[PDB]
Design a protein around this ligand. Sequence first.
Ligand SMILES: [K+]
Ligand SMILES: [K+]
Ligand SMILES: [K+]
Ligand SMILES: [K+]
Ligand SMILES: [K+]
Ligand SMILES: [K+]
Ligand SMILES: [Mg+2]
Ligand SMILES: [Mg+2]
Ligand SMILES: [Mg+2]
Ligand SMILES: [Mg+2]
Ligand SMILES: [Mg+2]
Ligand SMILES: [Mg+2]
Ligand SMILES: [Mg+2]
Ligand SMILES: [Mg+2]
Ligand SMILES: [Mg+2]
Ligand SMILES: [Mg+2]
Ligand SMILES: [Mg+2]
Ligand SMILES: [Mg+2]
Ligand SMILES: [Mg+2]
Ligand SMILES: [Mg+2]
Ligand SMILES: [Mg+2]
Ligand SMILES: [Mg+2]
Ligand SMILES: [Mg+2]
Lengths: 90, 95, 58, 59, 42
Amino acid sequence: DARDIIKRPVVTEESTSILDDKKYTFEVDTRATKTQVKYAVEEIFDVKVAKVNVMNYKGKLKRMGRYAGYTNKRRKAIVTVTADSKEIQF
Amino acid sequence: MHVKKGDKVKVITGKDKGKSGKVLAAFPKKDRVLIEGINMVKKHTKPSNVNPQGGILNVEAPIHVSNVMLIDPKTGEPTRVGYEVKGDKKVRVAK
Amino acid sequence: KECVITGRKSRSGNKRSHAMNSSKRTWKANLQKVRILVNGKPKKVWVSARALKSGKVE
Amino acid sequence: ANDIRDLSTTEIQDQEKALKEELFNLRFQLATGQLENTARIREVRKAIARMKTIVRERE
Amino acid sequence: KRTYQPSKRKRKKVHGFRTRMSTKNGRRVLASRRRKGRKVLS
RNA sequence: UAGGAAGAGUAGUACUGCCCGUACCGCAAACCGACACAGGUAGAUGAGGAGAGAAUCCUAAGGUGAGCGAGAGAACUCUCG
RNA sequence: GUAUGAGUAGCGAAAGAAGGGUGAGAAUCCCUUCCACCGAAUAUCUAAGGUUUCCUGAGGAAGGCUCGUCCGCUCAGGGUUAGUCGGGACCUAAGCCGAGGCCGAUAGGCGUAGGCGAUGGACAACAGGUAGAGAUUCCUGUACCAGUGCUAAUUGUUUAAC
RNA sequence: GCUGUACGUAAGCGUUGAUCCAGAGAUUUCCGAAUGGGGGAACCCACUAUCUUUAGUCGGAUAGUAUCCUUACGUGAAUACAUAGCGUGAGGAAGGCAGACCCAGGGAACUGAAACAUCUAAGUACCUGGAGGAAGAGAAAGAAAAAUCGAUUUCCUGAGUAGCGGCGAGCGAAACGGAAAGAGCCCAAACCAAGAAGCUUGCUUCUUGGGGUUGUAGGACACUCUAUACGGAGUUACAAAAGAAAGUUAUAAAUGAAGCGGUCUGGAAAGGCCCGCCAAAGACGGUAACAGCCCGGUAGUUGAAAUGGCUUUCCCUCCAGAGUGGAUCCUGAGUACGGCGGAACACGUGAAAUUCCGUCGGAAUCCGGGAGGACCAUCUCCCAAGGCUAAAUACUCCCUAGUGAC
Ligand SMILES: [K+]
Ligand SMILES: [K+]
Ligand SMILES: [K+]
Ligand SMILES: [K+]
Ligand SMILES: [K+]
Ligand SMILES: [K+]
Ligand SMILES: [Mg+2]
Ligand SMILES: [Mg+2]
Ligand SMILES: [Mg+2]
Ligand SMILES: [Mg+2]
Ligand SMILES: [Mg+2]
Ligand SMILES: [Mg+2]
Ligand SMILES: [Mg+2]
Ligand SMILES: [Mg+2]
Ligand SMILES: [Mg+2]
Ligand SMILES: [Mg+2]
Ligand SMILES: [Mg+2]
Ligand SMILES: [Mg+2]
Ligand SMILES: [Mg+2]
Ligand SMILES: [Mg+2]
Ligand SMILES: [Mg+2]
Ligand SMILES: [Mg+2]
Ligand SMILES: [Mg+2]
């Protein structure tokens, strides 16, 4: 269920700035684990993963007039690969 | 709806009474029909990604279905409609 | 708390006085905790003196 | 779907895997801004649904 | 000082769902709040 | 010690190491006080001269110039001399 | 709902000034320089609590007791990286729950084993960089704890290395 | 034609039949009785098995693992057989609601009495437990009286009567009568049979089958006659659990008459004027203004693949019942009653029957026993201390169609 653990990449200026150091920012299932993410990325892209970082984000409050609600709860992994491996592209 | 896209149509009531036209669109969620040359109306359109010149545009608006009557493409005259089964295919019938 | 045989137990009524003042009280049963055979084996159970004066084996 | 029922319980799961790969690539393209056709998402997702469904039906 | 001096732990262990559902008379509170239809039970 | 025991520990290697929190305020305009409220809010650090001293006066590093102003300088009220 | 008082009381302890700049507009925003205030604090950390108030870019309707080109305001995008920090998968205290059990009109009350429960005990990483936003987390170096396999030696076989 | 409210832009699907509607299925994260253990709700940490990945750690799938009750089985202490206990398996429950209706347990006060205590308010409010679609009650140990009636319940009356009551305030029936609705049954016991347990030791005393259930007394037991599926009954009691078919209905729908009539006003005609028409269809709503003839539709007539219900048929299941005798035997025991203390009956201890609770005592059992408002006799009516039972009654979170001098 690699394709279900790894939902999306996180395309932002921070992320792109960080890609040159062979680090990849993925958005992931909130129940995933660091180790699952490791083996899933290794599966899905045939890279070697050295280290995997992960943070959890609360949902931000937004409005559209009379109607408030929190954006979805996010979990952002930052995989990094062994230097002697092939890159994930974006 | 007793009137369908692609039909030829007469207008019963309204300011455009007596006129005729094709059915360019239908809205059964509202029981309205979009008919050529009927209920032409002037939209004051600021320029945007399309209509980037902008302007006052004459275009057709919808009018209700009950104000409208179908025309038999063989006679060319207006006909109230019934339904019959040809073989195993329901169809529309003039009367 | 109730007799295992005829399930008699605390019921409730009034305590009346001279002057017929009504107050509230309970009539408890004379339940004694003694052995009997509930089944082919024994057990130490609340049982009532009424039920005990003849017919049940300790 | 009728075309889908002609498959013997493993080709069906292989197509499921393939559709999962395709869907991941589409979510990736979309997150990157590179996807022109957005309605292929629903189509692939519903194909997956049908395959899991007929698998269970045979089970 | 003043009378509300907050604490999450105290709040939940007094007024929280498990404290309500531990007690016969706290399940009535929840039955009564579901009966009014409140968005929030505790 | 009771026990279990056919595998045991030594060195060097390479690899592996989960979940939650981590922003920001935090003597404060973000906490408790209905307020951008002269109130209250635990602990670690907390320099110099003179000094017993964390007192006091002036100050260092560092923070601030406090969310209405200017200008007349009259009785009365307040705080001061 | 609107008056009256009434353009009245009040505008919430405190030192500002000028020059440049931005801008439709400046006592009020930005910069500079002098000046002044705190300094066992009016500084630096950090709990609890609050929960995005943080950063960036636009904005000035309302909020801000004035003003506003600004904000803890509004929009939109971003931002919180841990084997070693703190809490769990480690321990328990007061207390709480409590199989069975003892009590008791019911409902339930007490309570053993057992288990939860820190404000305590145990437990292995330090110094620098980080020009928008995190740092014992990331990066650079140098390490430590626990385990695993691969090699290379050594040892042990049922009066039994471990 | 469509991708909801919800515009928007983008991208797309649809007569090789979409969107939509109906039926049945599948999927159904985490929490919650929540049940693998914990827990501050929607979070955390696991074990055991099989498989899988890794060079191997690390990691991943899937299944099971709560407590209690009953029931079997196996283990198993002091203690010697054994029981307790422990474990496993097969069932079952747990919790919620409709702030409604009812059954029980427990049970106020304000108030009223122009104070107030008996009394009232009131067995109300409230707590709790049990439920079920109704519940409760119920097939006479009855109601009654010169005459009988024949299970309960609900309604009208009786009646604001009889009566209760600091005889104050106030509480207040029942039966006859008339109606709705209707329905009757099962055990216990003697007695026969088997089995096991005591050897109660030639007797009991427990588990099942038959038998039998009631008041002019009935039954067992003796005989005669029938009866073994001839016929009958049934899951609404009288035993219980299934299955088909047919029809009907509900949950989608289809068809469905007749004016584009002319003219006037008008932004627009459904309105005014003049002509017609349909009607088993002049319900409603909509449409540029008040439409039977514009639209959806209505009356009417049709139709349902699938599922659900109901009514019939079949299957299936299961079924001794009259008579005459009456040697003998049985017919609900720590109850029925009584004393004491309380309560419910309209009935406040009152002359206090009747019913119930607690505690003491404590019957006869068929030449017997109860009731008829203390009680006695006579007469009359009836068989308790065991159980089941639809309908008529009460209520409405809900569904469908509809109504309102709201
Ligand atoms: K000092
Ligand atoms: K601590
Ligand atoms: K009943
Ligand atoms: K009408
Ligand atoms: K009496
Ligand atoms: K009688
Ligand atoms: Mg972390
Ligand atoms: Mg910080
Ligand atoms: Mg000020
Ligand atoms: Mg004045
Ligand atoms: Mg003033
Ligand atoms: Mg000081
Ligand atoms: Mg800011
Ligand atoms: Mg302002
Ligand atoms: Mg703990
Ligand atoms: Mg920072
Ligand atoms: Mg009074
Ligand atoms: Mg009008
Ligand atoms: Mg009597
Ligand atoms: Mg008495
Ligand atoms: Mg009474
Ligand atoms: Mg008595
Ligand atoms: Mg008499």
